[PDB]
Amino acid sequence: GDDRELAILATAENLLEDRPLADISVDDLAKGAGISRPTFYFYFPSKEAVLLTLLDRVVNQADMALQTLAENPADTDRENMWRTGINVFFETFGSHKAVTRAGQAARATSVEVAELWSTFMQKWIAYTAAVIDAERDRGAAPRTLPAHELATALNLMNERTLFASFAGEQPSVPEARVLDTLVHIWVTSIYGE
Amino acid sequence: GDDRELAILATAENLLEDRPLADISVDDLAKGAGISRPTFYFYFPSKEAVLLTLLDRVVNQADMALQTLAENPADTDRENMWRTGINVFFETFGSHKAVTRAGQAARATSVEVAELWSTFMQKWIAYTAAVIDAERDRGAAPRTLPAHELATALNLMNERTLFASFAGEQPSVPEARVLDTLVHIWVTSIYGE
Ligand SMILES: CCCS(=O)(=O)NCc1nc(-c2ccc(C(=O)NCCC(F)(F)F)cc2)cs1
Numbered sequence: 001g002d003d004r005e006l007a008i009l010a011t012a013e014n015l016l017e018d019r020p021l022a023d024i025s026v027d028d029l030a031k032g033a034g035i036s037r038p039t040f041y042f043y044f045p046s047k048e049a050v051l052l053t054l055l056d057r058v059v060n061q062a063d064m065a066l067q068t069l070a071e072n073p074a075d076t077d078r079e080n081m082w083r084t085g086i087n088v089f090f091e092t093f094g095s096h097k098a099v100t101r102a103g104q105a106a107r108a109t110s111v112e113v114a115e116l117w118s119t120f121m122q123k124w125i126a127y128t129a130a131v132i133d134a135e136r137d138r139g140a141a142p143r144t145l146p147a148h149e150l151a152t153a154l155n156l157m158n159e160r161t162l163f164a165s166f167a168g169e170q171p172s173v174p175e176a177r178v179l180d181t182l183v184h185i186w187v188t189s190i191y192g193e
Numbered sequence: 194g195d196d197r198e199l200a201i202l203a204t205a206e207n208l209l210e211d212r213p214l215a216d217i218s219v220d221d222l223a224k225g226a227g228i229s230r231p232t233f234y235f236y237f238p239s240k241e242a243v244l245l246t247l248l249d250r251v252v253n254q255a256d257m258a259l260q261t262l263a264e265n266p267a268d269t270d271r272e273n274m275w276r277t278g279i280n281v282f283f284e285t286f287g288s289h290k291a292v293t294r295a296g297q298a299a300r301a302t303s304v305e306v307a308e309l310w311s312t313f314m315q316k317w318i319a320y321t322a323a324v325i326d327a328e329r330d331r332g333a334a335p336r337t338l339p340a341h342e343l344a345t346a347l348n349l350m351n352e353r354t355l356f357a358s359f360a361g362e363q364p365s366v367p368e369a370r371v372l373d374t375l376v377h378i379w380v381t382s383i384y385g386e
C-alpha cells in the first residue's frame with residue numbers, strides 16, 4: 001500500500017505538532033496509521049527515516065515553488081520581486097511548522113538530514129547570487145560585496161529568523177512582522193552603497 | 194581549591210576542541226584536572242554544569258567587552274562604529290570556538306543554557322535598538338522598520354552567520370570574510386531607504 005506509506009507520513013506530521021521525535025514511538029506511528037509494528041518496517045527503516053522523508057517533501061516543495069517563480073517572472077518592482085521570493089519560504093515552512101522544527105533539530109543528530117539541508121541551502125544561495133549578479137549587470141545594483149558571500153549571509157539570516165518566529169522563540173520577530181522585516185534588509189543591502 | 198575549579202574548566206575546554214560533550218566523561222575531566230571522580234562533584238553537579246559555566250564566562254566576557262565600547266565611544270565614522278561593535282562577538286566567540294559550538298548545541302537539550310543564551314540575546318538586541326533609535330533621533334538614520342524588529346533580525350543573522358563560519362559549516366561565509374560581510378548588511382539596512 002502506497003496509501004499506507006502516506007498514512008504513516010500524515011500520522012508523524014500530526015504527532016509532531018504536539019510532541020518531539022524522542023517522544024514518538026514506531027508503535028505510535030503504526031497504530032496511528034492503522035497497521036502493525038512489523039508492517040511499519042516494510043515502509044521505513046525507522047522513525048528518523050520518516051522525519052527525513054517529511055523534511056524532504058517540504059524542502060522539495062519550497063524548491064519546486066521557487067523554480068516556478070523563476071520561470072514566470074512576476075510583473076512588478078524590485079521590492080516585490082524579492083518579497084515574492086522570500087514568501088515561498090515564509091509560506092512553505094510556515095504551513096509545516098512541526099516538520100520545520102523537528103527537521104531543524106535533527107541536523108544535530110542525523111547525517112542525511114544535515115546533508116539534505118546543506119544541499120538545498122547551497123542551491124538557493126547559488127540562485128540568490130545569480131539574480132544579484134544579473135541585477136548588478138543591468139546596472140540596477142552596485143558592485144559592493146561578493147555577490148555569493150552576500151547571498152550566503154542573507155540566506156542564513158532568513159533560515160534563523162523564519163524559524164525562530166515559527167517557534168515563537170525569544171527573542172523573535174513576530175510572525176506577522178517577519179516578512180517585511182526580511183525584505184527590507186535584503187533590498188537595502190542589495191541595492192545600497 | 195578554586196585553583197581546582199579552574200583546572201576542571203580548562204580541561205573541559207581543551208577536551209571539547211577534539212570531541213563532543215557526549216564523548217567526554219566526568220572521569221575525563223577529573224583525571225584531566227588531576228582529582229578523583231567524587232572530588233569532581235564537590236565543584237560541579239555534572240559535566241553539563243561545566244559547559245554551562247564555560248558558556249557563561251564567554252557570554253559574560255562578550256557582554257562586558259560591549260559595555261566598554263559603549264562607555265568609551267570610538268572616534269570614527271559610523272561604518273567603523275558598527276564594525277567595532279560586531280567585532281566583540283567575532284573576536285570573543287572566535288577565540289572560544291569549542292565552547293561556542295557546544296554551548297549552541299546544548300540549547301536543544303538544556304533549559305539553563307537556552308535561557309542564558311536567550312537573556313543575553315534580548316539584552317544585546319535591546320542595546321542595538323537604543324543605538325539605532327539614537328541615530329534616527331540625530332537625523333543620521335531614517336525611520337523605516339521598527340528599530341526593535343530590525344535589531345532582532347540583525348542579531349539573529351550574526352548569531353547564525355558567525356557560528357556557521359567558526360564551524361566551517363557548508364555553506365558558510367569564510368571566517369576571513371564574515372566581518373565585512375556582516376558590517377555591510379548592518380550599515381546599508383540601518384542607514385538605507
Ligand atoms: C524572476 C524574478 C523573481 S525571483 O526569481 O523569485 N527573485 C527573488 C529571489 N529570491 C530568492 C530567495 C529568497 C529567499 C530565500 C530564503 O529565505 N532562504 C532561506 C531558506 C530557509 F529560510 F532557510 F528556508 C532564498 C532565496 C532567490 S531569487
Ligand SMILES: CCCS(=O)(=O)NCc1nc(-c2ccc(C(=O)NCCC(F)(F)F)cc2)cs1
Binds near residue numbers: 275278320
Ligand atoms: C559608542 C558607539 C559604539 S557602539 O556602542 O559599540 N555601537 C555599535 C553597536 N553594535 C552592537 C551589536 C553588534 C553586534 C551584535 C551581534 O553580532 N549580535 C550577535 C551575538 C551573537 F553573534 F550571537 F553572539 C550585537 C550588537 C550594538 S551597538
